[PDB]
Amino acid sequence: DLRLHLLLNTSVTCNDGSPAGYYLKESRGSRRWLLFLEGGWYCFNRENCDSRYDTMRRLMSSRDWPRTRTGTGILSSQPEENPYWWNANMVFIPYCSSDVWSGASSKSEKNEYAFMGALIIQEVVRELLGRGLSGAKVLLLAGSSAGGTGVLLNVDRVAEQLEKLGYPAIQVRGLADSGWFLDNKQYRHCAPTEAIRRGIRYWNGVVPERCRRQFQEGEEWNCFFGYKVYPTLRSPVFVVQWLFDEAQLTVDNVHLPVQEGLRLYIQNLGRELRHTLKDVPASFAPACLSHEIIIRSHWTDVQVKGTSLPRALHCWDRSLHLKGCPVHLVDSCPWPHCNPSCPTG
Ligand SMILES: *[C@@H]1O[C@H](CO)[C@@H](O)[C@H](O)[C@H]1NC(C)=O
C-alpha cells in the first residue's frame, strides 16, 4: 500500500545507474512524516560488488522493483499493528547504493558503480516537499541495520537541508534500529573497521561534519560507529539495539554447548553495548539475540521493564513537546533471552 515513485532527478541513481526512488503512502490530515531507510549490508570493492550484483540485485538496482510494497511494523497504517504512528505519512526508501547510505559518487568512466546513498536521501526529501512534506511538523528519519547506521550518518544533514531550503519549523528526528555497532575484538580472527575504511574511499563516503572534524582525514570510518558519532549529533535520536545483535556477532566471528571463553565473550559484548547506551537518553535495548525490529509485524511484542517499543517511542514524542512513560530502556540481564519477551525465531 506504499506506491513507488522513481526520482525525477534521474542523475541520483542506484549502484547500476538505474534511478533511485521511494515508496509513499500519504496521510492527508497528518503533519507527521516517517522516512524509513532499508538496510542490507554493503559492498566495498569491484569484486564483492559484482557478486552482490549477481545475487542481491534489488539492493543495487531499481530495474526489478515492484510498483507497491506493504507497510509493516512502524510502516503499517493499522493502529493494531502500529500503535505509534499509524496515521503518519509513510515513506520507505529502498537501499540500492550498498554504501551504508554514505556515498556521493556517480557511475562514470572511472567508476563501475554509483554510490549515492547520501544524495538519495537528500533528493527524496527535496521531492517530497512538493508532495506535502512542506507542511510537516515532524520528520522522523528511521532505518534498520545499514539503514539504522544511515540514520546516524544523515539525520543532521536532513535537518541542515531543510533549514537551508527555508523550512526551519520541521522538527527532524532520528530512529536508528540495529545500526549501533562496536569496533571490538573478534572472538576469532570481515573486521568492520577495515571494510568501511575501504568502502569510504570506494564510495566517496561522507560523514556528519562535527564527527568528520573530530576524527579528520583517513579516520572518518570512526563515524560509522554509533557510540562515536552519536555524541556529535544535534538532532534527537532514539537508539534501538539488541544487546546481542546477530550482525555484531557475525562480524565478531561468533557462530552458535557454549564454553567459558565464548560465554565470557558474549557477556562482555552485552556489557559493552549497555555501557555505550548509558548516556543515550532515548534508547530501547533488549537482551536478545536478534537483528532489526521496527518493520517487523510483531515489533509490538518485545518489552523492556514492561514497556514496549511503540510505547517508548510515544513517550519520546511526549518528552519532545514522565510518570510511567519511560524513554531509556536498557536490559541489565547478561545473557540472550534472559528477557522473556525476546523474539522466538
Ligand atoms: C540532481 O542531483 C544532483 C546530485 O544530487 C545535483 O547536483 C543536481 O543539481 C540535481 N538536479 C536537479 C534538477 O534536481
Side-chain angles (χ1 to χ4, degrees), residues 1-27 29-66 68-109 111-345:
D1 53 340
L2 287 84
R3 184 161 47 93
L4 175 60
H5 300 270
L6 291 174
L7 292 178
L8 297 172
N9 186 343
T10 56
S11 292
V12 180
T13 71
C14 298
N15 289 131
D16 68 352
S18 60
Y22 60 94
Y23 293 77
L24 168 67
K25 177 174 254 193
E26 281 170 312
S27 186
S30 182
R31 294 196 192 262
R32 299 187 205 254
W33 286 75
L34 176 62
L35 275 63
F36 174 88
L37 308 178
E38 184 183 26
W41 292 95
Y42 54 87
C43 68
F44 63 89
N45 62 37
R46 175 67 177 272
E47 296 74 15
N48 63 44
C49 292
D50 282 352
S51 174
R52 185 179 172 89
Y53 199 68
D54 273 324
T55 62
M56 296 181 192
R57 188 169 294 177
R58 283 170 291 173
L59 297 175
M60 300 188 71
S61 179
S62 62
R63 286 164 202 195
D64 302 320
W65 286 357
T68 59
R69 284 187 64 109
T70 295
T72 59
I74 201 176
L75 290 171
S76 172
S77 288
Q78 292 187 130
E80 303 95 325
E81 180 162 334
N82 179 8
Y84 175 51
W85 266 28
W86 58 271
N87 197 37
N89 297 274
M90 285 168 311
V91 179
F92 173 91
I93 312 181
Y95 182 40
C96 66
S97 54
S98 309
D99 56 3
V100 201
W101 299 94
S102 79
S105 62
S106 294
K107 181 168 171 54
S108 70
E109 72 165 20
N111 299 326
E112 173 77 348
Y113 297 107
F115 300 95
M116 303 192 72
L119 300 172
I120 291 164
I121 294 170
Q122 300 284 108
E123 185 64 34
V124 172
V125 166
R126 208 181 56 77
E127 296 186 20
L128 286 176
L129 287 162
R131 290 178 167 269
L133 184 64
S134 60
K137 174 95 169 271
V138 181
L139 189 170
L140 178 58
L141 183 67
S144 296
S145 302
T149 311
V151 170
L152 299 174
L153 295 171
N154 289 279
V155 64
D156 278 8
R157 187 167 305 109
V158 175
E160 177 193 13
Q161 173 195 9
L162 292 173
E163 291 157 25
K164 290 176 169 195
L165 288 172
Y167 296 102
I170 302 180
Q171 293 188 64
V172 178
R173 307 174 181 168
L175 170 57
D177 168 27
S178 297
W180 184 275
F181 298 107
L182 302 185
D183 51 341
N184 63 344
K185 292 288 188 48
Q186 303 183 300
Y187 175 65
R188 290 195 181 92
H189 304 294
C190 179
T193 61
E194 185 53 57
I196 292 174
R197 190 60 259 154
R198 305 179 222 194
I200 290 182
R201 157 140 86 71
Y202 192 55
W203 307 328
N204 193 36
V206 301
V207 300
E209 177 175 85
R210 177 169 295 99
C211 193
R212 178 172 65 242
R213 289 172 163 162
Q214 285 177 5
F215 291 99
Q216 301 182 327
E217 63 93 20
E219 298 284 335
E220 296 102 338
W221 67 265
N222 282 280
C223 301
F224 281 65
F225 288 84
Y227 75 96
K228 302 187 207 198
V229 61
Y230 173 98
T232 76
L233 299 184
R234 294 309 177 247
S235 303
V237 178
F238 193 112
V239 174
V240 178
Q241 186 70 28
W242 302 113
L243 292 179
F244 309 100
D245 183 87
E246 289 169 327
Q248 179 76 51
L249 288 166
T250 293
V251 302
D252 282 331
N253 295 322
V254 173
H255 304 292
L256 288 167
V258 178
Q259 289 177 258
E260 181 183 11
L262 183 52
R263 175 174 61 251
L264 296 170
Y265 186 92
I266 290 171
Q267 291 173 328
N268 285 333
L269 170 65
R271 187 280 301 186
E272 294 175 320
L273 211 294
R274 181 172 155 85
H275 176 77
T276 63
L277 297 172
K278 178 195 226 175
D279 300 326
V280 175
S283 49
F284 187 87
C288 315
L289 170 65
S290 190
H291 191 51
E292 302 185 323
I293 181 188
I294 63 175
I295 61 169
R296 296 166 85 167
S297 287
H298 298 93
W299 76 303
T300 57
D301 286 345
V302 61
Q303 294 174 13
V304 170
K305 297 166 162 68
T307 299
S308 70
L309 177 57
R311 176 156 185 76
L313 292 171
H314 160 68
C315 301
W316 186 43
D317 282 15
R318 286 186 56 199
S319 79
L320 293 175
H321 287 173
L322 304 168
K323 178 174 184 174
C325 212
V327 302
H328 181 87
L329 293 162
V330 179
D331 264 333
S332 57
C333 58
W335 194 256
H337 228 314
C338 58
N339 184 326
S341 73
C342 285
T344 62

